[PDB]
Design a protein around this ligand. Structure first.
Ligand code: 54S
Length: 327
């Protein structure tokens, strides 16, 4: 069947560390006091949780409370363990407490307060410099979690908190994150449609940290080219065709042939034959101020079919695209 794959970096992290580190199911939660928190207002609702502005009445500090919706107990312990493992890491959201919500009877995670700059304002007014600055901040978070043997699996703007007034960034919502274990087959139903890596789209389960680097590439492409989303698929199948119309079909076939992956025969009628496009074709007078030869070269090294060939987060930090960023 398919040829196995392993990450080219951080394969050994979960071997070198003790079992309690990654064996999330064995972790015992020391529950905090739910009466310490007063909910102020709802901030958002997703498929797996509701997030609220809150006050920790014990220290009069603003906090964010994420109340989990009833789901498998394994998904809840996994997020808790990942958050505790990553706590203190650069640009990782800080988990401050874990309480039992009295109404839902589910865990409520308490985080450090965040103040999101309006999403439309960020998309529409971040400069070329600000894009590079914040991309570098995301890379610090990704190299940290990858170096800690964790893949985020849901990198997208909704999961990046930017307090522009304070040049502060946090990588949030670790609910889909997982521990990377070489040879482990993972669920391909992760990430939002437009951010899914070719590995997910061809049903290749032995993926790794490099999935996050593809999603980072999609987020960057959309920002610099002013095309939201960059790969605009109608469904999961058309999503791969949209990617093939840019990266070309020849390299897609080279990719699946390397891993002995067979495409779903549904693709025989819809994929066609497409040449690889030069990135300069997406440049126009309304996005030229966000594009540079360095930006294109960086994007070219993230958006590769072969998950083993993409820049890693640490290599990405060395790229000329970030030379202008004050470090
Ligand atoms: O929806 C959001 C985030 C919204 N992000 C907006 C945004 C993020 C990045 C970029 C960006 C793109 C390319 C390059 C550089 C930057 C842009 Cl243009 C916009 N926040 C509101 C909800 C919230 O704060 N949730 C939350 C808070 C704390 C913890 C958790 C959690 O699940 O752990 C959730």
């Amino acid at each position: 069947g398919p040829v196995p794959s392993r990450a080219r970096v951080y394969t050994d992290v979960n071997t070198h560390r003790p079992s309690e580190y990654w064996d999330y199911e064995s972790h015992v939660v020391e529950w905090g006091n739910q009466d310490d928190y007063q909910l102020v207002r709802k901030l958002g609702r997703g498929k797996y949780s509701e997030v609220f502005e809150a006050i920790n009445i014990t220290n009069n500090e603003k906090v964010v409370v994420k109340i989990l919706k009833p789901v498998a107990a394994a998904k809840i312990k996994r997020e808790i363990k990942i958050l505790e493992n990553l706590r203190g890491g650069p640009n990782i959201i800080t988990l401050a407490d874990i309480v039992k919500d009295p109404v839902s009877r589910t865990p409520a995670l308490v985080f450090e307060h965040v103040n999101n700059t309006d999403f439309k304002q960020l998309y529409q007014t971040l400069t070329d410099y600000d894009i590079r600055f914040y991309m570098y901040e995301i890379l610090k978070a990704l190299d940290y979690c990858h170096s800690m043997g964790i893949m985020h699996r849901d990198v997208k703007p909704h999961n990046v908190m930017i307090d522009h007034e304070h040049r502060k960034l946090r990588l949030i919502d670790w609910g889909l994150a997982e521990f990377y274990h070489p040879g482990q087959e993972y669920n391909v139903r992760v990430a939002s449609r437009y951010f899914k890596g070719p590995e997910l789209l061809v049903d290749y389960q032995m993926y790794d940290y490099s999935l996050d680097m593809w999603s980072l590439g999609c987020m960057l492409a959309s920002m610099i080219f002013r095309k939201e989303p960059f790969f605009h698929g109608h469904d999961n199948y058309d999503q791969l065709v949209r990617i093939a119309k840019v990266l070309g079909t020849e390299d897609l076939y080279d990719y699946i042939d390397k891993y002995n992956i067979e495409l779903d025969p549904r693709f025989n009628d819809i994929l066609g034959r497409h040449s690889r496009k030069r990135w300069e074709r997406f440049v126009h007078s309304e996005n030229q101020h966000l594009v540079s030869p360095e930006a294109l070269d960086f994007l070219d090294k993230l958006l590769r079919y072969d998950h083993q060939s993409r820049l890693t987060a640490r290599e990405a930090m060395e790229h000329p695209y970030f030379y202008t960023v004050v470090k």
